[PDB]
Amino acid sequence: TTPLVHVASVEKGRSYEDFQKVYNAIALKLREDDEYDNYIGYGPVLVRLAWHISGTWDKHDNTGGSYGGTYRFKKEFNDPSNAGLQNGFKFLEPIHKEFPWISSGDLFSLGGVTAVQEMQGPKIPWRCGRVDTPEDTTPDNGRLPDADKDAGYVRTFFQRLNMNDREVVALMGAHALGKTHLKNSGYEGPFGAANNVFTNEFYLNLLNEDWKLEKNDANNEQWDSKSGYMMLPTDYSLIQDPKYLSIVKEYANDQDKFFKDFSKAFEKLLENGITFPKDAPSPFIFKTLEEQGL
Amino acid sequence: GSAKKGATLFKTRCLQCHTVEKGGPHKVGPNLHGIFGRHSGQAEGYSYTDANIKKNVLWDENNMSEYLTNPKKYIPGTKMAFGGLKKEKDRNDLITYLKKACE
Ligand code: HEM
Ligand code: HEM
């Protein structure tokens, strides 16, 4: 029949300016709804939503991924790995009604990019053209990674998304943002100090704080610092594996580099599984609220 | 402004990096006791960026409002990783609370 191929197809008569206005709506809602999750804001959950809709991809048969907007169906919606993302979905709801022409995949991925940018992270080039696919194309539950694992598991899992060591370390830096919630994932607590500003604090914290491995209220084991942070076992395994450890120290010493590699990795992530034709526009870099004067 | 609402804003948005009480521990950022009417970059025992010291400003309610609106804008090169209170109300409330909290 031939391998499954997903050709990027730009929304009819839409262009960069249109997508900037979607971005603006997302960013403005981010700025204004600042009470959510005890004043963390929606940023981190939008980033997590974009990663999760993307992280279902399987490079071997092109089954998962962002293209199909499949997060909009119950099977994928109620995936236990995805508990809590309904908040990001509901955030993005009024924006979808304002721009009904945008495909669901384009909207989710754009949510994540906007969040990373607004939170003073690096600029992330973004490509439009994802197309909504039928409910039977939705990936089965269980494609997202588990937290109670080691470095070997992490490296192996990321092979499926075509990510190498540097890309994995870079992407994991997103755990600078936000927190774990007990009712969502059986883990509880802030990953770091700046909850909604994108920094290299993940690396610095991993290396410089004093961590202890203990059981939380769900009887899950997590690493807690005396300074009040927490890390999942998968996070901490990035200092337990020598090759990972090198890269960790690298990003800890150089935020600029980390921003560059993260931008590359994140865009790759959001784009895995997508074939962009020749006629396709160049990737879009969107203007933050800040550089529009707000 | 509402000192109580300000107390909530501090607990959720500043406390992870600052304590307020006298002789309070330095954390991510410096202890903020006595902050108003003292020069920036002057907490004893704390290691500031040179940018914070170079800014050289006696902290008061207006400059505090400005800083907290956008800390990187008021002190470029600052290491305080904080987005900014973008609602004037919240700035007034926070500063009200901080006024008494750190006396
Ligand atoms: C081995 C890889 C990973 C594991 C095991 C993992 C696991 C988790 C878990 C269990 C949570 C808690 C969810 C909750 O309780 O609300 C979480 C939160 C989060 N994850 Fe990861 N994740 C991984 C990779 C990533 C990647 C690659 C990204 C982004 C590119 C990411 C972004 C986030 C963000 C931003 C949050 C905080 C969300 C919020 O505060 O609401 N994660 N992660
Ligand atoms: C509205 C919330 C906050 C307020 C009102 C606040 C208060 C202040 C004040 C008044 C200063 C100047 C201190 C001086 O010059 O002696 C300062 C600096 C600093 N704060 Fe914050 N803080 C807040 C949130 C945070 C957060 C979230 C972090 C870290 C994630 C942080 C970490 C720091 C650091 C590291 C400095 C020193 C900056 C430098 O030396 O360049 N603060 N803060």
Inter-axis angle of helices A242-253 and A255-271, nearest 10? 120
Residue B80 counted as an annotated binding residue: yes
**Angstroms from B55 CA to nearest CA on chain A:** 22
Q: Where exactly are the structural domains of chain A?
A: 4-144+266-294, 145-265
The residues that bridge with B59 in the sheet, in sequence order, are none
CA distance A76 to A112: 18
Q: Which residue of B has its CA nearest to A209?
A: B28
Indicate the CATH number for domain A145-265: 1.10.420.10
CA distance A124 to B62: 35
Q: Which residue of A has its CA nearest to B10?
A: A39
Indicate the CATH number for domain A4-144+266-294: 1.10.520.10
Nearest 5°: phi and psi at A69? 60, 25
Q: Which ligand lies nearest to the CA atom of residue B97 in the structure?
A: 2
Cβ(A234)–Cβ(A168) below 8 Å: no
Of all protein residues, the one whose alpha carbon is nearest to atom 41 of ligand 1 is: A45
CB-CB neighbours of A291 under 10 Å: 7
> What's this structure's resolution in Å?
2.0
Catalogue all structural domains in chain B, each as residue range(s) with its CATH number: 1-103 (1.10.760.10)
Method used to solve the structure: X-ray
Residue B89 vs residues A156, B5, B24, B103: alpha-carbon distances, Å = 50, 10, 28, 22
Query: Pairing mode, if any, of strands A6-7 and A274-275?
Result: parallel
What is the full DSSP assignment across B46-98?
A: ----HHHHHH--B--HHHHHHHHH-HHHHSTT---------SHHHHHHHHHHH
CA distance A170 to A185: 23
**Longest alpha-carbon distance in chain A:** 57
Is the shortest distance between the CB of B57 and ligand 2 below 6 Å?
no
Structure tokens at A81: 């790995």
Residue B14 counted as an annotated binding residue: yes
Inter-axis angle of helices A16-32 and A86-98, nearest 10? 130
Provide the 8-state DSSP code for A162. T
Q: Which of A272, A265, A264, A266 is nearest to A60 (CA)?
A: A272
CA distance B75 to B53: 10
Q: Which atom of ligand 2 is nearest to the CA of A194?
A: 30
Beginning with the edge strand found earlier in the chain, give each strand of the sheet holding A221-225 in spatial order.
A211-215, A221-225, A230-231
